[PDB]
Amino acid sequence: YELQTLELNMETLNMTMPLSCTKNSSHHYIRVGNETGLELTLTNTSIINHKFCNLSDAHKKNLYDHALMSIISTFHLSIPNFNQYEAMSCDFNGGKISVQYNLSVANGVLQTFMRMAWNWDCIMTSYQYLIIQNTTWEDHCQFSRPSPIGYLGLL
Amino acid sequence: YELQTLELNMETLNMTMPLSCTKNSSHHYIRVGNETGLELTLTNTSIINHKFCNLSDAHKKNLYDHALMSIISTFHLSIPNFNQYEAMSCDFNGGKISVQYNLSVANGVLQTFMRMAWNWDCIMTSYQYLIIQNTTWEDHCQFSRPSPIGYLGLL
Amino acid sequence: VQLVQSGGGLVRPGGSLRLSCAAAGFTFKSYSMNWVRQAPGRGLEWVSSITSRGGSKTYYADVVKGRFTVSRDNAKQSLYLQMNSLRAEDTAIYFCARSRHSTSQPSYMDVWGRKITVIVSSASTKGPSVFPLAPGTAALGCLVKDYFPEPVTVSWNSGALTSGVHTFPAVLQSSGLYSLSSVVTVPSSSLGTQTYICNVNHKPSNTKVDKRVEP
Amino acid sequence: IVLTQSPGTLSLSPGERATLSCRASQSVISYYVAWYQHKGGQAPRLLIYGASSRATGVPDRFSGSGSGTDFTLTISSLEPEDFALYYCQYYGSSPLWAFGQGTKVEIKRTVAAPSVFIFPPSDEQLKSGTASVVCLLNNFYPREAKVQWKVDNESVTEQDSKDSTYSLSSTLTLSKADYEKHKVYACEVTHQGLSSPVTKSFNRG
Amino acid sequence: GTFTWTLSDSEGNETPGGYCLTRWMLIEAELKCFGNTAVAKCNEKHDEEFCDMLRLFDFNKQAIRRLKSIQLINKAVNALINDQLIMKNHLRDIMCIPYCNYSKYWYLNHTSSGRTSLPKCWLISNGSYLNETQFSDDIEQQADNMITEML
Amino acid sequence: GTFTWTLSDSEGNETPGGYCLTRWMLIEAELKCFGNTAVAKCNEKHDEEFCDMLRLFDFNKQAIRRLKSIQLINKAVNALINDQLIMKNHLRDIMCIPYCNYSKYWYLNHTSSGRTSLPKCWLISNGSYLNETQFSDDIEQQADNMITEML
Amino acid sequence: GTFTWTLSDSEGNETPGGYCLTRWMLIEAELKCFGNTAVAKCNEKHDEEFCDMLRLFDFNKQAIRRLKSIQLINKAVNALINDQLIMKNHLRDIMCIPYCNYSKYWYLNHTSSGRTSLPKCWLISNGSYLNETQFSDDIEQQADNMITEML
Ligand SMILES: *[C@@H]1O[C@H](CO)[C@@H](O[C@@H]2O[C@H](CO)[C@@H](O)[C@H](O)[C@H]2NC(C)=O)[C@H](O)[C@H]1NC(C)=O
Ligand SMILES: *[C@@H]1O[C@H](CO)[C@@H](O[C@@H]2O[C@H](CO)[C@@H](O)[C@H](O)[C@H]2NC(C)=O)[C@H](O)[C@H]1NC(C)=O
Ligand SMILES: *[C@@H]1O[C@H](CO)[C@@H](O[C@@H]2O[C@H](CO)[C@@H](O)[C@H](O)[C@H]2NC(C)=O)[C@H](O)[C@H]1NC(C)=O
Ligand SMILES: *[C@@H]1O[C@H](CO)[C@@H](O)[C@H](O)[C@H]1NC(C)=O
Ligand SMILES: *[C@@H]1O[C@H](CO)[C@@H](O)[C@H](O)[C@H]1NC(C)=O
Ligand SMILES: *[C@@H]1O[C@H](CO)[C@@H](O)[C@H](O)[C@H]1NC(C)=O
Ligand SMILES: *[C@@H]1O[C@H](CO)[C@@H](O)[C@H](O)[C@H]1NC(C)=O
Ligand SMILES: *[C@@H]1O[C@H](CO)[C@@H](O)[C@H](O)[C@H]1NC(C)=O
Ligand SMILES: *[C@@H]1O[C@H](CO)[C@@H](O)[C@H](O)[C@H]1NC(C)=O
Ligand SMILES: *[C@@H]1O[C@H](CO)[C@@H](O)[C@H](O)[C@H]1NC(C)=O
Ligand SMILES: *[C@@H]1O[C@H](CO)[C@@H](O)[C@H](O)[C@H]1NC(C)=O
Ligand SMILES: *[C@@H]1O[C@H](CO)[C@@H](O)[C@H](O)[C@H]1NC(C)=O
Ligand SMILES: *[C@@H]1O[C@H](CO)[C@@H](O)[C@H](O)[C@H]1NC(C)=O
Ligand SMILES: *[C@@H]1O[C@H](CO)[C@@H](O)[C@H](O)[C@H]1NC(C)=O
Ligand SMILES: *[C@@H]1O[C@H](CO)[C@@H](O)[C@H](O)[C@H]1NC(C)=O
Ligand SMILES: *[C@@H]1O[C@H](CO)[C@@H](O)[C@H](O)[C@H]1NC(C)=O
Ligand SMILES: *[C@@H]1O[C@H](CO)[C@@H](O)[C@H](O)[C@H]1NC(C)=O
């Protein structure tokens, strides 16, 4: 005869499953492990201008963090279709991680955004570049509490 | 209200589905049809020294038994994170069958064996080679009663 | 959740006894029950088992088969352990515990109970006798002999001196009566200064004997 | 099943790690193995249920491992209230509840010299019925001690928190008419700290 | 997805439905036929294993007769069984927990009526089988609904 | 496929079944435990959005202890959850309809008995939650069920 | 996976549940309204053909109304329907057994009450629709349910 509400904390499921949260439509957060963190930032500018990258040696050079490559691999695979030209590029020199996508096609990447940190048409955003970067702990989860369904559904 | 037990015989499900059984920790028997047979073994010795082997002519020759190659097809397809680089020691000259690999990456193939006939870390067996062979209708299936769900799990 | 119960005590050889384990605070029928004893000095021993809300499968220890019966009543939620033809090896402390036995849950007794003393004896309680043990640093003692298994309190100088006093727990005897010795150690200076009196108070028969041990 | 613990008694001080071993004979299913704690007055607790698991209200100083016929219970750090009896338990086989024999963990210290005393009977004990003589040792360590009685050449308390050092008594008993035979009686006690045996005797009168 | 196959019944059956295992698919046993009511619980629960074996037996029985390779099951592996039972048992095995090897089962029979329960498979652990006592409550919990089956 | 996992239960529970939820994965609350009767309904419904979270909690609880990467959940995701719920809520949100984000839940407590019912979840739309009145009938509908629980 | 879609309900319906077919949805017929009691059995079954068709009809209504290519169903097909029914019917057709084809259905109408039954689908076999007596017992089997519906 009495109504009650409970809100679940999704922070305990830390390492068993990656998590994700939202500050603003510019950048999305991914956390894996105890501390490992990735930013998915929308920006009109380009921070790297190298013209050649490839994925075979990225897993072949074998000195990387192998628990991290998986999320960007599933991001690369889950996009519906892809242009023959490799507009997207990557760079992992020095151990760092940098994956850039030249938005300026966008339909698939925008639905991937709608799912990773979660009418139907090809409306595009005014931003022109996606940057995929390493980050520190800092704080990206304050407006909305983090959840694991941003990654479970796209597996 | 009394208790009873019954034990199913998987021998009848003979030709509809492949069957598999175990002798010891390094031996596996695969049977399809009525007389054909495959041996899956772990052994420290190399046999085939031919470093060149392609899979296109394997299905292109068409002189092979087309109801058998599918099982080893699913076997090398189900293994995860396979590099497709080298060490593929396949051989089918004269119509025969032979597949072997180096174990010295092995985590995936050992998990494959554990699934195909039945903690979690990168277990390193001391054996160095995996042998695929044709065989005759012997009495391998004696240590444990053969079951078909080993193949169902992989599929 | 906890189990409350009572029972046990002194029973003459050849009698009959009943152990009751009452239950409160959980769904009784959905659990299995165990009766386990602990003899003085050794490890725990099985006594009996019973399964869940069928009363069907019953198991007893290999040693004590036959003289025991175990049953469970769901209406009053009580474990009843009926003991017949008592022997001389039943003196121990009993626990009544509960555990479930399925696929998902491993086996463990979690909600235990209260220990229950059980003792068998031929004679009744008979008041002990107090003996003196007067001798850099020396020691003096009070001994009590011809003593019943029930607990007693023995004290020096009405409890004024509570430092360096050792009371020895009763130990297995031959005749069938316990006994115990207490010793207190003091330096040479304190000798002959403070009056020391051995006091024994024993609840069965309420024997309160106070003997002033002096030369 | 024959199920035993090892070692019989452990002596260690807080700060380091310690291990206890449980061994059986028949093949052991790891999923039905429990580890139990038994202190003085309180009812026994459930330290671990499962081969390597955790209880609801247990500190993180405990861990378990093993397989086959070997079980290792490891405590990485100690506590002032972690010295009592331990047990390893298996469900099934014969009988259904296979409790272990026993284990005990104590504190380590250097050797100490016992204080010895001998108490002979008195003249009033003709009313006692049977003569008794008490050979008493106090404040000795370690547990290894042997007591014997000689003609013409048991009781123990618990380890105390304040001192952690043991006591021992021997109550030699002789029938009244049997005592008037001899006149000199000795009790001797030996322990590893004192290699040379020390024997003390008394003369009737 | 979800399994969709159905029981084909027999000719000499005493009831309209209900499978009856024959002599050739059992070890050291005769032919036994279960009641229709017990089989009626297969098409309404996803946490049972014996009905998967019955579905495979039926599929093979129709395959041998009504048709004269192995792509028949590659195309129909899902329609018969549930892969998540395989996955769940594999996860139980990899965590060193009792699991089910799909080989032998235990059921509960009635001396007079013959009404039987749906068998659940016997559990193993590292090449060693269990005893009856280790899952005693299971053996009795089903017994309870037997009384409830009288209602 | 179909979810197949089972609930582990806990030592020291009022009843054999029933999942008790601790205080390390809640917000502004201590540990909270549900009745076995409410737990009995997860293994029979597919549209419930709550029991998936209990299954994920139990999987993590049993993966932290009896182990020592992330591929485990890659292999177990289907056996744990139902991706069709994710797709259903995605298609419902893309059509601008209130949808459940699996963040907070409402249940019908009972003051004395404590027989809490299985919670559905609060919905959301464009970042704003709802109000108690907007799903009034829902709040009442489950109430009817509890009356039938008296039977 | 499992189907997860729901019912959109109507405005003038007597009962909150239930789905009313339109005249422009049938052939040589009028609009028909099914009771909520009958349609309450779609969410608790997996071997029916009518409820999948209703799910597709609901999805079509919502898609044409609340939006303005074909990838929508390319992504929602698993949610709306169950491919295992397609596999089952295809296997029954390849082995030459009478089978359903999602074209025409049959149900029972109680004239006075107005309560209906879930329409199980008709059967075809190699270009010839079945004749009524062939599945006679089924036509009366569901009839027995109406007796049990009196309770
Ligand atoms: C990463 O996950 C761990 C595991 O849950 C979190 O640590 C828990 O934190 C809660 C809240 O303080 C404690 O009650 C638990 O005891 C902790 N568990 C362990 C194993 O330490 C940790 O907080 C998570 N990381 C972050 C940054 O939140
Ligand atoms: C291959 O499968 C067939 C089909 O079950 C087996 O033949 C059956 O064997 C049993 C056992 O004696 C007989 O009762 C059946 O009548 C046989 N069915 C036939 C002949 O159609 C055969 O034994 C199996 N062979 C192997 C090597 O496994
Ligand atoms: C399992 O048993 C088989 C057969 O009993 C063993 O196969 C042996 O293989 C070696 C070559 O690797 C031969 O020289 C032997 O003649 C085979 N038979 C034997 C040893 O009986 C196989 O080695 C066994 N598995 C293991 C791990 O030892
Ligand atoms: C989002 O917030 C970050 C805060 O670091 C800011 O740098 C960025 O410009 C913001 N973007 C938008 C679109 O508000
Ligand atoms: C990939 O890119 C690296 C970087 O220059 C280059 O050395 C390599 O040849 C390319 N191809 C492969 C197959 O690695
Ligand atoms: C992210 O991690 C890589 C790993 O070595 C490191 O090289 C890079 O500097 C990190 N990025 C930061 C700290 O912003
Ligand atoms: C990104 O795309 C834009 C398209 O407007 C192009 O002008 C620009 O050169 C591209 N950046 C590259 C190729 O680095
Ligand atoms: C990027 O460019 C678009 C149009 O060129 C503009 O609308 C948008 O505000 C720009 N974003 C930023 C962060 O300046
Ligand atoms: C196995 O079968 C192949 C196919 O005919 C044949 O070439 C080979 O010789 C066979 N091996 C044995 C050992 O019989
Ligand atoms: C393993 O690698 C060695 C080279 O180190 C090669 O000689 C041998 O043929 C390989 N064996 C297999 C089975 O691939
Ligand atoms: C294979 O070689 C490894 C490494 O030398 C050894 O440990 C193992 O026992 C060998 N296996 C045999 C000889 O069967
Ligand atoms: C299984 O049983 C064997 C005894 O045959 C034992 O050596 C082994 O440790 C047990 N456990 C595993 C995981 O093999
Ligand atoms: C099962 O019971 C038998 C008694 O016949 C016993 O020998 C065995 O150890 C028990 N446990 C098993 C087989 O795991
Ligand atoms: C159950 O018992 C009856 C009578 O003993 C027997 O006819 C029947 O076959 C038994 N059930 C099975 C499955 O064998
Ligand atoms: C339901 O409410 C009662 C008091 O009204 C409280 O004791 C109980 O904990 C509540 N249930 C839950 C699951 O919190
Ligand atoms: C059932 O019959 C009644 C009256 O005979 C009619 O109004 C109703 O439309 C019928 N049902 C359907 C589904 O047409
Ligand atoms: C139905 O009846 C007609 C004539 O009465 C007959 O030709 C037809 O074959 C029957 N239906 C079937 C499916 O046989």
- DSSP helical segment count of chain E: 6
What general outline of chain E do the C-alpha atoms trace?
Answer: globular
Q: Strand portion of chain C, in percent?
A: over 45%
How do the strands of the widest beta sheet of chain E line up side by side? 3-4-5
- Structural shape of chain C: elongated
Q: How would you write the strand order of the largest sheet of chain C?
A: 2-10-9-4-5-6
Order of SSEs of chain E: EEHHHHHEEEH
Radius of gyration of chain E: 17 Å
Largest sheet of chain C: 6 strands, mixed
PDB class: viral protein/immune system
Keywords: glycoprotein, antibody, lassa virus, viral protein, VIRAL PROTEIN-IMMUNE SYSTEM complex
Entry title: Lineage I (Pinneo) Lassa virus glycoprotein bound to 18.5C-M30 Fab
Chains A, B: Glycoprotein G1
Folded structure, characterized:
- This is part of a larger assembly, with two copies of chain A (155 residues), one copy of chain C (215 residues), one copy of chain D (205 residues) and three copies of chain E (151 residues).
- Chain A has 155 residues and is an alpha+beta fold.
- Chain A has four helices and seven strands, in the order ββββααββαβα.
- Chain A has a six-stranded antiparallel sheet.
- In chain A, a hairpin with a 2-residue loop joins β2 (19-24) and β3 (27-32).
- Chain C has no helices and 17 strands.
- Chain C has strands at 5-7, 9-11, 16-22, 32-38, 44-50, 58-60, 68-73, 78-84, 92-99, 116-120, 129-133, 137-147, 152-156, 165-167, 178-187, 197-202, 207-212.
- In chain C, a hairpin with a 4-residue loop joins β7 and β8.
- In chain D, 2% of the residues lie in helices and 47% in strands.
- Chain D has one helix at residues 176-179; strands spanning 4-6, 10-11, 18-23, 33-38, 45-49, 62-67, 70-75, 85-91, 97-98, 105-106, 115-119, 130-140, 145-151, 166-175, 184-191, 194-203.
- In chain E, strands 3-4-5 form a three-stranded antiparallel sheet.
- In chain E, a hairpin with a 2-residue loop joins β4 and β5.
- Chain E is built from six helices and five strands; from the N terminus they run ββαααααβββα.
- β1 of chain B pairs antiparallel with β3 of chain E.
- Chains E, F, G: Residues 1-35 are annotated as: Fusion.
- Chains E, F, G: Residues 36-99 are annotated as: HR1.
- Chains E, F, G: This is Glycoprotein G2.
Q: What key attributes describe this structure?
A:
part of a larger assembly, 7 chains, C: 215 residues, mainly beta, six-stranded mixed beta sheet, four-stranded antiparallel beta sheet, elongated, D: 205 residues, 1 helix, 2% helix, binds a molecule of 2 linked components (NAG-NAG), binds 2-acetamido-2-deoxy-beta-D-glucopyranose, Glycoprotein G2 (chains E, F, G), viral protein/immune system, glycoprotein, antibody
